[PDB]
Amino acid sequence: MVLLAAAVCTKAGKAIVSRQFVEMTRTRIEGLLAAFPKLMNTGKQHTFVETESVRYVYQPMEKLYMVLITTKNSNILEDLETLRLFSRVIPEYCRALEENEISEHCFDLIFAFDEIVALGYRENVNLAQIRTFTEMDSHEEKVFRAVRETQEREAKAEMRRKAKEKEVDNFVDKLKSTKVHAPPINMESVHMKIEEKITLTCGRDGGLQNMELHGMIMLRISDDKFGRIRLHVENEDKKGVQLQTHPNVDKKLFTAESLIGLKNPEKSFPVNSDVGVLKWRLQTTEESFIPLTINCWPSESGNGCDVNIEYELQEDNLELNDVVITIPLPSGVGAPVIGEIDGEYRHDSRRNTLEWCLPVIDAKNKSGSLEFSIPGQPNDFFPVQVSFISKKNYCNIQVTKVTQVDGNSPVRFSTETTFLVDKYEIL
Amino acid sequence: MRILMVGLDGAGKTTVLYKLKLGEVITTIPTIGFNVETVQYKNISFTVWDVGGQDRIRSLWRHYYRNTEGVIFVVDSNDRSRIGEAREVMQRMLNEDELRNAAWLVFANKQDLPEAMSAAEITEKLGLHSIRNRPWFIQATCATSGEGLYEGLEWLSNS
């Protein structure tokens, strides 16, 4: 909108016709306006008066006034054109001038407001053309003849059926001139969470169908004092893991120096927001990479298969806790009988699983075995699922120290490192 | 004449209609409202209200309570469902008196579309068997069939 009403006026103290774009109130807004207009306020001449931030815009055209109203700023000329423009239009629209003609072509006239002006926007040119748009059309006709006809044919036929059936700059310059430690309490102002997840699928044969390792270092700083720092990364890893630095982080610095810092050292890391400064990925078929191999050998003694399963820790570096090897069992057969075992077990009748737990798997104690018997087939035993958590990362990557960009002083920091299993399965 | 197509329209009750009117079919959302056509014969031009017997629309038709002149009942001949229930309603038409100013046609539609009843079977079932103070010859259509319809009708305007 740029006009809540256009009212076309005659001298009478009264505006000859009007339309209310928006209703709510009563005429008293409009009614009051009408009264004021009729009164003119005795005021002598002048085709414009705005008072009290309300434009009362008018044009005498004769004994007639055409009126528009507005309150906040506008570009004048445009406006004028319109008043004037009105003064071009009418003898066409409603016929000449005398209220009556208009009285007959009221509908036409109101229609013209809308048509002309869509909410304070100068819609077009060309009056005749303006006629054109509606109650003067074309499409409808085109459609009608064909259609009406078609139907008509059906009808006709029916009748029978029935019947029978540089510069910028100048300015510019001038101008210019398990739980992890949860609360912040138990963390240093510089804190990093290094988390890795492993997705691994192995055949029962022991072949490695797929291994995927993903890891990242999440940095969180609680105090702006710590904002410009560099992380010292120690990388022991032989595996051929691919490392990628955050887009903000200086890639070259990391490559040569093995330090994590922002491209612009002046910039500060965000405060109280996690940033993944570094990420790494490893995807490989090589069995040598398997952290913990599982060998399950079912064999069917006559009536009553015996299952022997063992594990061995490949990477001496890891220390695995809460290791659970889940083995599915046949149902209806009763509980499994447990023979020699390293560690302990839990039998779940509902789940039909045998969970083998522990012992702690260290470099010192690489392997262990479990033997049990239940009536079943070798297939009943797979897939085996392995679950564990490790405090130490699979990839030998660690943040040894953190230093200030300016002065390179050492800074206290804390780290939470976890190695988790997304999926570790033996087909 | 005011001729009435009622029942819930959208089923092709409306199809039934659109088929008459253009030859076409329901290419509308299933239609609760008045559908209007004038069909000219004996140049009584029959103004057809194809109106869904859906809830309101059934409920509310009082301005259309005036005085009838023609009856189409457009039928799901797979419906054999709401008809007893219908019979139960239908009485109130019977209990209307405007309603006794039409020699009519129930049209059994939707025959191909699953099946249909004995012409008789239905006849008692809507309660139809029982009239006479209006004529009551019976005519089956389908909605992918129907002929001789017009015999039914023939008698009807010429009642």
Swiss-Prot record, chain A:
Keywords: Acetylation, Cytoplasm, Cytoplasmic vesicle, ER-Golgi transport, Golgi apparatus, Membrane, Phosphoprotein, Protein transport, Transport. The coatomer is a cytosolic protein complex that binds to dilysine motifs and reversibly associates with Golgi non-clathrin-coated vesicles, which further mediate biosynthetic protein transport from the ER, via the Golgi up to the trans Golgi network. Coatomer complex is required for budding from Golgi membranes, and is essential for the retrograde Golgi-to-ER transport of dilysine-tagged proteins. The modification N6-acetyllysine is found at residues 166, 174, 225, 267. One of its GO terms (biological process) is retrograde vesicle-mediated transport, Golgi to endoplasmic reticulum. The keyword DNA-binding does not apply. Signal peptide: none annotated. PANTHER family: COATOMER SUBUNIT DELTA. It comes from the Eukaryota. This is Coatomer subunit delta. The modification Phosphoserine is found at residues 177, 409. GO terms for cellular component: COPI vesicle coat; COPI-coated vesicle; endoplasmic reticulum; Golgi apparatus; Golgi membrane. Its main location: cytoplasm. Belongs to the adaptor complexes medium subunit family. Delta-COP subfamily. The keyword Secreted does not apply. It comes from Mus musculus. SUPFAM superfamilies: Second domain of Mu2 adaptin subunit (ap50) of ap2 adaptor, SNARE-like. Residues 187-427 form the MHD domain. It is a peripheral membrane protein. Pfam families: Adap_comp_sub, Clat_adaptor_s. It is found in: Cytoplasm; Golgi apparatus membrane; Cytoplasmic vesicle, COPI-coated vesicle membrane. Oligomeric complex that consists of at least the alpha, beta, beta', gamma, delta, epsilon and zeta subunits.
Swiss-Prot record, chain B:
Belongs to the small GTPase superfamily. Arf family. It catalyses: GTP + H2O = GDP + phosphate + H(+). Interacts with RUD3. Interacts with VPS13 (via C-terminal part); the interaction is direct. Present with 19300 molecules/cell in log phase SD medium. GTP binds at residues 8-15, 31, 53, 109-112, 143-144. GO terms for biological process: endoplasmic reticulum to Golgi vesicle-mediated transport; Golgi to plasma membrane transport; Golgi vesicle transport; intracellular protein transport; macroautophagy; positive regulation of mitochondrial fission; positive regulation of mitochondrial fusion; protein localization to Golgi membrane. Pfam families: Arf. This is ADP-ribosylation factor 1. One of its GO terms (cellular component) is plasma membrane. Disruption phenotype: Increases phosphatidylserine levels in the outer leaflet of the cell membrane. Simultaneous knockout of DRS2 results in inviability. The gene is ARF1. It comes from Saccharomyces cerevisiae (strain ATCC 204508 / S288c) (Baker's yeast).
